[PDB]
Structure formats: C-alpha cells, structure tokens
Subunit: 454 residues, 4 copies
C-alpha cells in the first residue's frame, strides 16, 4: 500500500502539507489530460497562428506515459534509464532505430544538465508529449510553416502555462466537476483520523483561493457530519503557493481575508488562516518546528530534485497515480513472468553445457565435440525464440509504445530514480497513507549490494 525509500517516523511529524490538486483532490486523469490537450491545441492556433490541421489532431491517452524526457532541440521524446541511457526514442511519433539513435546522440547516454532537454516531472507531461509528438510531425511535413522544434516546445509550454493561469482550465472543470474530479469519502475520514492524533494538516496549491474554496467544498463537505466544515480540517491553506519556488525561494506571504478575498502584507509570524505566496523557510520558522517535523505530499516532483531536497529540508512524499495500473499490470503478467523465468533457467543450464563441451575442444582436446555441441547451438536458438514470444506476450500487458513507467529495459527508469531520490515514501493515492496509523514508523528494506550475502 505505502512504499518506503527512506525511514520516516510519523510520530515525529507535527504537520502534513498537501498539494490540493491531484493529491488531496483526485481528478479523472484521462479527462483532465484530454481537456488540457484540447485547450493548448486550440490556444496554439488562436494566439500563435499554428496550422489549421492541428485542431483536427486526435488525442490518444496511451501515446505517452509518465517519466518521459523531451529534447526541444531535436523534437525527440526519450525514455531514459536511471543513469540517463536511452532505452527507446521517437522523433515525433516515428520511432528512432537503435542504430540511428547512436548516430544522433554520439552515445547511448545523454546529459540532462544540458538545458536543451526538458526533464522535469510535471502534471501535464503526458498531454505535452502527445501534442508535441504530432506537433513535430506537422513541422516536418512543411518546415516553412511552423517554428523550430525548440520553438514549438517553448510555445506548447507557454500555452500550457497560460491556460492554467488564464482561468480557461479552472472554469471548464468548475462547471463539470462530476466529470473531472473523483470524490472519495475515505479521504475525509483519513484526515479526521490523523487530526484526531494531533496532526496538523495544511494545504498549499498554485490555485487561487476563490477556485480552491469551490473545489474543497465540492470534494470534502458532502462527507462531513452536521455542524462540521472543511475549513476546520486545515490549520493553514496557502494559495498561489508558486511551487517549486515556494520551497527554496524567498517570496513573501500575503494574508488572505477568507471573506472578501482581499489581502494585506504579513508583519510578524503567520497564524492559522489563509495566505497567498510565501516560502517554506519563514513558514517553518513561524511554526517553531524543525523541517524534519514537516511532511509534504505532492503528485509531481515539479522542479529540480537536488535544489528541492538540499535547499528545503522538509520530509517529502509522493503520490503516483500511474502506480495503480502499473501494479495491476504486473500482477496480471505474473504467470507470463513465471513462464519466461523457467524458459531462462533452461537456456542457462543448456548454455552451460555448451561452454563445457566448448572449453574442451580447445582446452583439453582440439577436435572431437565438433558435432556434439552443434546440437546445442540449435537447441539453444529454439529455447531462445520461445523467450522472444513470451516477451511479446508480456509487453502486451503494458503500454505498447513505452512499456512500464518505473522500468527502463530491465533496470529502474529515469522516473524511478526521481521518485527514489525525491520521496522517502510513495503511494498510489493519498488515502493509502491515511489508512495507516498516524503513529506508524515507516522502514525501508535493506537494499543489498552485488557482493552481499543473504
């Protein structure tokens, strides 16, 4: 239910901070992504005068997965490993051959230090990868009509940001709430469960208060009892947090009058209430607590991991919605996984008898097992072909284009690495955590190195 990377004693936590959207309030990711895609697509032709055709682009949710990286320079989308090696790549929607991948990058690795790459985990990655993919396909068709790959990417990023602060996005959903947000009673039960154990919960969102009030009201209030209000659930509600800068920057707080919505500058320490802007530094101080006593839970890293972890110090946990289907798919592939595990053991011992009757014809003899081993080279190619098919069968249980989110080839993917480094704890959704005792001591499993003995 809850996965541990680093120890975190919930008994030592006095405040739990929650991202409002996608963390505290769940959204139908498929609909939400589709919506953002349509708006950004529309906005491209409306303010950037992109080719008419794009309005006709079909949105396929499975065209991308979470954790992908795009290099704005070459209009490519890559799935990297934990150390930045290219597992697979596409130029637009056209896959790049391993051969040509190496000719393109002069290496199997890439350097994310190079800003020409977009490697930040964001809540729109998927939509942005799908639109960008087909967006560079158009570009190729008639280079003279559309800007450059790096220009296109910057444009899409701009539209994606504008629409979020434009009001465009929030309005469409605030009027189709039942379609975009999925309510969950367990969430309010969990918050009450934790508050009941002395925990103080606060939320910080990049959304304005007016819109935040409407949303919390719709997704929390209904599950409350008579005489209860969602406002009593949170010690603080920081709006327009301006994450990630909120964590390591120094932007000032604005006290928000919950009624009229007007604000005043903050003088002195902050007190339970509604604010806008701010920074973790001042907030941790005013609360008179140590950063290791504060736990923040978000849905996306949304920033550079080293600066976030070094320049902040709050314990950080992650909610990874894609985990739902990832786990589900692995449980489904169990029987297939087993059939290849045994088809490997056979290829192993069968390949072992091959080197044996091999380290003879040229280690003790000089010719005698010539035909003896040849029967193994054919019997080994057979057990191999079986494995290729069994692998095809396994992939069918995952995204057909990009495979799993946490795996890149057989090792952990670049995204798996980000979760591991950024999060001490991660789960599918917020309630998975609230299900546990507010005084739980989370322990990580012993990693175990290659030269370690059981």
């Amino acid at each position: 239910k809850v996965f541990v990377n680093r120890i975190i004693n919930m008994r030592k936590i006095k405040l739990i901070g929650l991202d409002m959207d996608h963390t505290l309030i769940r959204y139908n990711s498929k609909n939400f992504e589709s919506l953002v895609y349509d708006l950004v697509k529309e906005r491209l032709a409306e303010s950037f005068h992109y080719p008419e055709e794009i309005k006709k682009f079909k949105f396929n949710f499975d065209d991308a997965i979470r954790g992908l990286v795009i290099d704005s320079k070459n209009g490519n989308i890559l799935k990297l490993s934990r150390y930045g090696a290219i597992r697979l790549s596409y130029h637009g929607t056209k896959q790049i051959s391993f051969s040509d991948q190496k000719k393109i990058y002069r290496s199997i690795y890439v350097d994310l230090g190079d800003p020409n790459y977009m490697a930040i985990d964001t809540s729109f990655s998927i939509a942005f990868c799908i639109l960008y993919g087909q967006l560079v396909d158009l570009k190729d068709t008639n280079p003279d009509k559309m800007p450059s790959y790096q220009a296109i990417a910057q444009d899409v990023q701009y539209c994606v940001d504008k629409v979020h602060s434009d009001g465009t996005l929030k309005n469409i959903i605030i009027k189709n709430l039942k379609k975009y947000v999925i309510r969950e009673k367990e969430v309010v039960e969990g918050l009450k469960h934790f508050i009941r154990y002395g925990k103080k919960i606060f939320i910080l969102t990049n959304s304005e208060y007016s819109y935040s009030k409407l949303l919390l009201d719709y997704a929390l209030s209904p599950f409350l009892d008579k005489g209860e209000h969602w406002q009593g659930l949170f010690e603080f509600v920081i709006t327009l947090a301006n994450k990630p800068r909120f964590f390591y920057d120094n932007l000032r707080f604005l006290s928000v009058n919950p009624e009229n919505g007007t604000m005043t500058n903050v003088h002195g320490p902050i007190v339970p209430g509604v604010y806008q802007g701010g920074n973790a530094k001042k907030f941790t101080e005013d609360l008179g607590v140590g950063g290791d006593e504060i736990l923040y839970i978000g849905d996306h890293i949304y920033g550079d991991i080293l600066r976030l972890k070094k320049d902040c110090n709050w314990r950080t946990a992650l909610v990874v919605e894609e985990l739902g289907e990832e786990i589900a798919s692995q449980i489904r592939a169990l029987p297939i996984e087993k059939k290849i595990g045994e088809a490997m053991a056979i290829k192993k011992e069968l390949e072992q008898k091959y080197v044996d009757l091999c380290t003879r014809s040229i280690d003790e003899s000089s010719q005698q097992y010539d035909q003896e081993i040849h029967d193994l080279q054919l019997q080994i190619s057979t057990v191999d072909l079986q494995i290729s098919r069994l692998l095809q069968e396994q992939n069918s249980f995952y995204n057909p284009k990009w495979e799993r989110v946490f795996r890149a080839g057989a090792e952990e993917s670049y995204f798996a690495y980000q979760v591991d480094r950024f999060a001490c704890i991660y789960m599918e959704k917020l309630s998975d955590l609230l299900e546990h005792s507010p005084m739980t001591y989370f322990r990580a499993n012993r990693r175990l190195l290659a030269h370690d003995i059981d």
Copy 2:
C-alpha cells in the same frame, strides 16, 4: 567472485585493456600508500616550506577509507551517501557533530557540482585524506604559518602529482620491488587462458615505458615458460596514456621504438606495438571494432563518471582491492548481524502491540490502558539498549572511524554509487575475472522496486 551491475557478454569482447599499476600489477597498498604519504609530506616542507613539525606526523593507514570526499574550502572530510547526504564528517581529525554539521552546510546534502569539493576516486585518496587531516590540524594551531585549507589541499594535490612524474616514487619502488609489488602466478595463467580463447590484451598506463618494462619483467616473466616472453602477452602497450583524458580527449599517439625508447609521430592506423599518449577514439577506429567490443579494467574511476561513460563507449570494469577486507569483515559479522536482526523483530512486534493498545485509549476508549502500555515503553527501551550494544559490536568489525566502504549508514555510500554507475563488472582483483571462462555471459540480478512482488 565477480560482481555484476550490467550485462557484459565476454564472447562479444575482442580486446581487454588493463591499467598496468594496481590492476595488472598488484601492490602492497599499505606500503605503497605509506610511501606516497612520506614523499608528499617531505616534499611539502622541501618546496613549500611547510612547518617543520609535519615531518614528525605519524601515518595511520586506518585513519581513512576509500570513497571519502574532501571540501578544500572548509578543510573537511566527509563520508557521503548515494545521493550526497553527509553520513559523518571531520574537520581535520576532529569529528563534527550532527548538530554542527547542519549549521555548517545548511543542509544534510551537499552539491558535488561545486568544484570546492574533491570527489574523484584516486589511487592516493587514503594517503591524501590522512595527510590533509593532520595538515589542517596544524593550520588551526597557528593560522598565520600555513596557507588556507583550499591552498593546503591544492598544495598536497600538487606534491602528489609532482612526485608521480618526478621519478621520486617509481625509483624508490623499482629498488624495493619485493616490498611494494605482490606477484601472482595466477595472473599470467589467466592472461594466457584468455589469449588462448582469441582475446587480445593491451595495457595502458600513465607510466613511462622504461619503468613499465622493468615492472612487467619482474611481475610476469618469472611465471613464464622457456622461450616465452611477456611482450607476447600484449597486442598493444600504450604508455603515458594520460588517463582519463585518453578516453574522451584527442591527444595524439607517438610510436615508441621498444629498443632505444625514441618515438616518431604516428601517420596512419596504429599497429601492434608500443605507443605513448593517444586517445580511445583513434585506437577504437584503427582496430576496426566497436567500442562495445572493447573492455577496459581499471582500479580507480579517476575522473568524472558522466563524461567518461558518455564520451567514450568502451565497456568498463573495476577492480576494487578494498573489497577483500570488506567482504571478509561482513562474513565475520554474520553472527552479530543475526543477533540484531532478531533483536529487531522483537522490537517490531513489541512496538506493534504498543500502537495497538494505543489506537484504543484514543480510538475506542479514552482511558483504561494507561499503565498497560507503560510496561511496553520500558520493555521497548530495554530491547533497544540491547540493540545499541549489538551495533557497537558490529562496528568493531569494520573501520572504527569511517565504517564500511560501500555502505553509508544503511544505504549505499557515494562510492557504491560510483562503482555501480561506472562499472558493469567489479571484483577484488584481476585474477578473479581471469578465473572465469573467456566466453562467460555475465548477468546482473533483478534489482526489484519497493512496489514489486516476489
């Protein structure tokens, strides 16, 4: 015997490149380090006019371990984790308290991007950390007499480099070979074993040919049969390789006349023989092979890992001598490890009955188990104190000052991370690898994520 991080099919390898010193030719690390320390210490007072006292400094091999990082700015030596968190630190030889560590670094993490840190794995790290430690202790005592911490560090690094190219080091050992180099017959048997399977071996060292000939002659020739010569063992012997630049730079090759030692510039493709300088790019080309068909084995990363792995492409393996005692010590601590593993299981179930009779007095009741649980808080503190002692007993099996080389706290150390990223394969010594069949297929174990099922 041989530890795998990434798959490497020895059947696909046509050339194996070996570092001469510390990889192909083993040295008594204790004596070798002591020697380098004495020379560098002496050189400091001789050319830099450092205080007289240093000549009287006592060398303690256990004062440092491999994988440590020094920040020249503050005269500190730190043991980092895989993600750069400070596990323990010393200012000189004086340990820094966790408290003061955070006050000093404003975080538990550090950023190795910051050049004020020395984080390269080198063959003198240990000696350099010991001398530097006591060297900043002197500095403190009378700040006016010695340069700054960052000045001192640069000076030591200079002496360490000068002595290696000075002739100072090579001469002392070339005259006490039996004391500094440990000969191993298995090494020549292994090389012959691999050559016998079609493998071409070449060596590349940062040492001059004249000195190289003397060393190979002394450590390989004796184990050879009548009519055999060590020169027939190697396809190429690149001298003054100038590693790591040899891998990613473009420095030119100089053909070396094995007799008189004179050189001529290279025109055209290189051929079996003796060279000086060079670069992997030209060498891989002339040999008409793919970089993934070449495997280089070294004893130290000795450079920036990303540039080395990205800008080269040869398969790279590592020989980690410290692995000897590390493994040996873990096997010795096995019984202790078991006694704490059980003393944990008890603290676990005992701590579980604590939250149980806890999530009652404030979840179903309001007061009743007040004294009931208090007996557990005392019984839990006891089973805990036992664990502290059992841990003291365990540490006694490792370096008393810095603990294990591959572990930082309970997770992998910064050095473990370097091995993993830089090496596809690693072992205690070269012969461990030559012991295997030249046509072995090395496979890495499935890593397994926190949300994976067995």
Copy 3:
C-alpha cells in the same frame, strides 16, 4: 550635465520609470550609509552573537568607494579594472602587496563568474565594505570566535537585507526625515516640465506603499501649488517591485487600494493606480508600447547586467551620485594634471634622445657615446622623481585609499565598465536630466580606435 553612452531619443519615450529611493528622492548618502552600518553592526551582535568589540567599531565613510568587489572566500576587497585586473587589494583593512596579490590569485586577473566573489553594485556597497573590512580584522585576531570570511560576508549581507525589510531602517529615517532626505524643488518642477510634454512618469520601489506615501508626501508635496497633489504626478506607482527580478522574472501584480492598503489579485490589464510586485513583461504589454519606448532610471545596477539588458529591453539610465565629487575633484586637479603632462613630454623627448644615442653605440659604432648617454640616464631619473611627487599631489585630490571611482590605474575601472554597458545615459542626479528638453535627442561621442585617424 548628462553623459551619453548610447543614443536615446527622448522624443520616442512615452514612459519614464523612476526608482523612488536614491533616484527620485535624494538622501544624505553619508548619514544614510552610517545609519545602515550601525544597524547592521548592532544586528550582528544581537542575532548572530558576534564579538562585543564590533559595537565599538568606528565608521569612516572614506574607508571605501563605490564599485569595489569583495571575494567572500578570502576576506578581501579589490578594485578591478574594466577587464577584471586587480589594481589594488586589501585583506580586511591591510593592503596586499602587488607581490603577494599575485601569489594569492595566481594571476593579475580574476574571474567574476566565480560566485565566491560579490560583484554587484548595491546601495550599501560602501557600508558593507567598511564593516566587512574591520569585521575580518577581528576574525584574524581570534579565528575561533568568529565564523569564516565567507560566513561573515553572508551574515552581513543577511543583516543588511533583514534590516531593510525589518522596518528598522525605514522607521529611523521616517522619524528624522530632515536629516536623511535632501529635498529639491527642481525635481518637482522637472517632473511637471516632462509631464507637460506628454511624458508619463511611474515609480517602482522595493519599499511598501505606506512608507512610500510618507516619503513622497514629505519630499514632493511642499513644492506643489494650491490644489495640486503628488499623486497626479505619477501614472503608476509599483510598490515592493522586488527589483531586479521585476525586470526579467514573472512575479504577479497585486492591485493596491490606495486608501486602506489592502490588495486584490490582478485580472486583465493593469490601469493607472497603485500596485505591488509585478514584472516588466506584463506591464509593457498592458501599456501597449514597445520596451524601447520605456526608460527606467535607477541609482544602482543591482543585478547581473547581461540578464538585465537581454531579458528586459527597456531603455535604462543611471544616476550616479558619486559623480558629484569625482568631477569636482578632477576639476581641482586640473593644474596638477597639466604639470605632469608637461613633465611627461620632457621625459618623452629626453628618453627619445636616449634611444638615439643608444641605437648608435650598437648599430653604427661599438663604443663612443658611453658617457654621453649616461648624463641622460641621470637626467631622466630626475625628471622621473619629479613625476612621482606630482602624482602624489594628484592623488591627494581623490580618495586616499582607493583613488577614483571610474578609473582603475589609468584605464576605466570595473564600475566604469558596468555603467557603460548598463546605461545609455548617466548623470549625477535626476534633476540633471529633467533640466533638458523633454524632446532632446541624446547622442554619444565617436569612440575612436587606436588605428583611427582624426
């Protein structure tokens, strides 16, 4: 009166933005600096527990000049040239010898890219250089009691920033206005003169509105006629601008109700009124004008010049108060300047007759003018000694410790370079510019290269 670096046609300017403090409102720099110094000194011992002695530190305004650079790493203060060469340096208050300067920096140049250097022009540079100087003198005396040079510098910078947002500074002056601010009637006459020609003036300060209203009221209102108000002078008054980020960042605007001081978020284009925060991008857009139609005048570069000039595009001018005494001092040294100019011409022709009767004894003859020229070597040393004294006399007309602000040795100083690159136009004070016709076309003089002919 007004100095031109780059052409700027005031006829093309529709809006002039002014920094409120030090630009629109003049302050007694001596008193203001002294005040900031005392507060920061006091704050060091109050919150950082610095040694008691500092409270007893004497403030000498002439101990520093504008344009100096401090390297936090070594506790040094340097006067650099246009290309970053060290003209003179001090460790604390102790001058460093040219000899030792080179031994310290391994070069006569430094690299400001290196963040260990503080090279930003700020309104407290002088006070900060004086306090820091004596602050590292204390550090030396007893290294164990005070933090490191780089720690000290960061502490001072912190105190300097805290006191500015603390209220500490603004309060002391708001209560001694007649002592800190120097009122000038010409300023209001000039603003009216420009407004009269269609120019729109706006101010943007890093000060809160409440304090801004008090200040403008005190320094502008008195010079106004019956029925006139200072608020009618400005189209916009952006408060807590958060410069320099205001120029290139994206921070949001907050509409400020001039009455109660409360704010609301901005929706749509900004309109004449009072705001807080903001960014030049949105502001330039809403006003429907090109950035080259907007001119901003400040008193300090206060940021990185390339990012400010590249990422903004507004025309930028600078007010350099130190220019007053600099020019005044040069006019005073005129007669001395002339006496050395002639004492040079003599050393020139006299040195020319030296090479003449020199390129003979070894170009036509071989010995004959041996004693003939020796009379010149003594007569040349004399005319030289006279020049050394005449130079001593000249320096007496400038800061005794650091010489001129715009000159470093004989070439332009590092600060001269900053003005030139950042400002198209610069003057001693704001009114110098308002004195000109609002429709003036400012032209820069032809620079002229070494190989150009008159």
Copy 4:
C-alpha cells in the same frame, strides 16, 4: 604602424614568441582561404556524403569578413557589437530583417556563454562562414537530405580540422609555395635587428617540424647572407604546440632531434633546440624568467580570452592582416566622412531651432509658430535624405555585406573588443613591429570618459 592598447616596455622583454604560420610567415589570405574552402567542401561530399551540388559552390572571398559569430543551432551568422548586440544577421545567405531578428532572439543581445554559438576567432572563420552560409541554403531546399544546422556546423569544423592534420593542406601549399606564401625580406632584417639587441626569438606552431623546416627554409633562407642559417635566428622552435592548450594546459614536451625527426621525453629543464608539444608554464620556468618578460605574437585569438589571459600571464600581441584594407578604406572614405560630418552639423543646429520654436508653442504660448516650424520639418527631412545617400556612398568603401571589421554600427564590433582585451599591441603584420627599436616603450592613449574634460 603599431597600435597600443596597454603599455608594454620592449626593454623588459627577453623573449619574443612567434606563431609560424600567418604571423612569421605571411600567406596570400585570398588563395589560402579559397584552398581550405575547396578541400573542406570536397571532404564533405567524400566522407560525409553531402549532396553532389556543393562541389559546384562558388567561393566569394567577400561573402564574409573576420570577427563574425555563427550560432550552430539556427544556421545563422551574426555581426555583434562590443557588448553582444546584433548589428546585422543572415540565415544562410539570406539577410534577416531587424523585425524578424528580434522575433528570433527575443532580444537584440545574445549570450556567447551559450555554447550553441561559435565565437572563437580562427584562421578559417571567413571560409567557414562562406561555406556554412551556402551549406544551410542547401539544407533548407531539401531538409531530408542534409543533417541539422548544428550537425552541419560540427561537420564543417571537423573537416576543417581533419584537413589541417590530414596533410592535405600542407602538401598542396608545400608544392605551390610561390602561390600561397608571400616572402618578405624586411622580416629577416627585423629579426636580425632584434636579436642584435639581445632579444631571443622562438617560434611555436601547430605544424609538424618536417613541414616547418621546408617553410622557414623557403621564406627566410634566401634573404640571409653567406654562412648564415635560419636556425640561428631562433632560440627555440616548439612544433605541434597544440595552441591554445599550450598556454594554459599542462601537456608534456618532447625533445626533437632536428636530424632524423625522432623524439625522446624531456627530463629536466628544456634547452635551446627543437621540441614538440609542451606548455608555457614549464617553458617560462626553465628559462628562469617572469611571464611579463615574454611576449607572444599571434594572428588569431584562437581560444577563450579570459582563460588565455588569466591562466597564462605572458604579454600577448596580435597581428591583424585585415587591418591593411580596413585602414586603406577609411583613408579613402575621408572626403565622404567629412561631407556627412558637415551635413550632420547642419541637421544639428537646424534641429535645434526646431525644439526652440517648439518649446514655445507649448511652454510660453499655445499656438502661433504652427506653420513657422513646419518649414523646418521639411527642411530637416531634406538634409536627412542627403545624409542617407552620403552614407550609401561611404559603405561602398567597405565590405558591401558586413561593413567594417572593427566597427559594428557606430561602436566597436565584437572583434574590436576581442583585440582590445587580448592584445596589448596589434599591427597589420610582423615587420611593422620589427621596424621599431628593440628598446621601444609602447604607451596607450588616454581613453577618456564621457564626463571627462579636455
């Protein structure tokens, strides 16, 4: 004849180092550039399989000038000012409109820190800019056939480097010496003149010795007397210097046997003779002199200026061949320059009477000079049109496409800035300097700031 940026006392100089090619030995730049262009063009289609058409590309020497910068990312060539502002730009060979330039760069400035720009002054800049220009014109025509702009640029740079070390270039010229090298007797007379005054001259080239001997023999020997040899002219001749790394790097020296050409490693201090490789650090030391006593003269900055000036310390001078025509053209435009200078003075006083009868109709009156001034607005437009034509006439005296090399618009160009910062002294050719007395004291003219008085 010789232009001074910074003082340099030739009496204090004990060694003068000279680049062999383009500095000591003059080449017909037009032929040399054309040759390099043809070889690189040919090499592109030969090893990179570039489109057949390129072989048919016509080389126009005037298509580029020295000092241009290319941004590999967008396939553009720009002429920058001293502070990096774009004076004019071309995409391939197609000029970019000021309008579109700003839309492309989001600013009038660019940041050369960004490695996507090629801003190093090299001896092939011109040829490379011409070929690259037409090379991206082809790319546009059929994007699918040629690599990307940044790929193309890297390819051209590769061909340009390969051909120089290939032997291709050196061979063609060594066989048409009379066509590519221009011999000058004054050069040998000057060297003898300086040697005669105690100066030691050494040369360092990136060319092999064998080729160097042939060239010096052909360009110096003929002008020598009976019994004289060019080898007696130089104290040291460092071959394959590997500039610029030679200056700041640490590459080792190889002693070269002038006879057979074979080398041996250097042990101890270097002595008069022939070497290969090396570094300025060791060389300055062995000679037992201060870097400020050594003067190096080159033809191109060929590297990063700050690292070259900071990490070396030798006095550096520059030979700028383009200076010939630049000066010549300015002397020719003198009469035109004068006709516009007077046509400006008139537009000035005429524009002054305009603001006068302007600061009345709205400063004293309100309407009266309505038609009075209108006669000036037409009379001012006329004197302006005359100026536009007079400017057209002036440009005709310079490169029609890029204007002057040292001027960008009216201020100094980016290249002028490089010369100024890198060179203390610069001239058209080496003999211009040797013409002066070996004991000359070079002084730079007082720069003079905008607020300085004559």
